[PDB]
Design a protein around this ligand. Structure first.
Ligand SMILES: O=C1c2c(O)ccc(O)c2C(=O)c2c(NCCNCCO)ccc(NCCNCCO)c21
Length: 263
């Protein structure tokens, strides 16, 4: 890919990938600031379905603004020698992902863990509040800023009400049905489990055996996986992870409430 988009954004190294598109650290030359930028593969960008999805991503993202959700500052399409390339300019987050943090620290203190998710809930509730389901909650999509903020990201597959991996899927995603706020709650639960125990709820030889685990197995109570985890907190995690949406928290707000009640 080229080094300068539109004359304005000078792409640097690769921060991560949001499904098949590269996310870059770049510098906005008009505003003297570091910003992160997502660039549709290029091949990808000739397919409508993706062009659309991608345009829609930006608009979905941009159309919500909250300090615990990454901001969008801009989208365009650069006309390069390698053709047209739509992109999205987003608030940069100098930090690490929950993934990374769990992988290097091990689990985090319960105290820490509670607030961190607590925050995630507001973010996600705000999104729901605004008619956006994220559909893709997992450690690799939540960040801790250098200033210790929480930033939820990758509205890559988030759906308005306009109308890969294994272990952070909701059962209804698994069976392949309509998903909603609850599905996000569940995904979030998984993430909570992950952070508290150093371990995800379920693991397998491939996506499919984990998918079944989501649908079939009870989760090991966290306390069992790792001492110094409160009985009160156990039942919290496990509610988010209720197999039936009905038995889950009905919104992020409800979940958060309970979390704040145990911290
Ligand atoms: O920093 C971002 C980032 C950003 O600052 C602004 C917008 C973004 O979309 C990202 C970003 O996506 C990102 C990373 N990608 C996560 C890909 N999702 C996991 C697959 O579903 C993965 C990592 C990542 N930054 C942390 C890099 N530190 C770890 C070693 O470099 C970011």
């Amino acid at each position: 890919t080229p080094s300068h988009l539109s004359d304005r954004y000078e792409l640097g190294e690769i921060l991560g990938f949001g499904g098949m598109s590269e996310v870059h650290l770049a510098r906005d030359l008009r505003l003297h600031r570091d910003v992160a930028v997502k660039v549709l593969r290029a091949d990808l960008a000739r397919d409508p379905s993706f062009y659309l999805r991608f345009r829609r991503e930006a608009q979905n993202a941009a159309a919500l603004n909250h300090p615990a959700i990454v901001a969008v500052y801009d989208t365009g399409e650069a006309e390069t020698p390698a053709g047209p390339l739509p992109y999205i300019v987003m608030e940069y987050v100098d930090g690490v992902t929950l993934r990374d943090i769990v992988h290097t620290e091990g689990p985090m203190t319960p105290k820490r863990a509670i607030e961190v998710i607590a925050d995630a809930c507001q973010a996600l509730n705000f999104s729901h509040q605004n008619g956006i389901i994220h559909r893709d909650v997992k450690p690799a999509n939540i960040m801790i800023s250098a200033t210790n903020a929480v930033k939820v990201m990758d509205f890559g597959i988030a759906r308005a009400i306009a109308d890969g991996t294994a272990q952070y899927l909701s059962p209804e995603q698994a069976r392949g049905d309509s998903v909603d706020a609850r599905s996000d709650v569940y995904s979030l639960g998984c993430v909570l489990y992950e952070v508290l125990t150093g371990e995800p709820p379920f693991t397998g030889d491939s996506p499919v055996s984990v998918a079944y685990q989501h649908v079939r197995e009870d989760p090991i109570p966290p306390s069992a996986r790792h001492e110094g985890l409160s009985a009160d907190l156990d039942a919290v995690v496990l509610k988010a992870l209720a197999k039936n949406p009905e038995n889950r928290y009905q919104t992020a707000a409800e979940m958060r409430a309970d979390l704040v009640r145990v911290h």
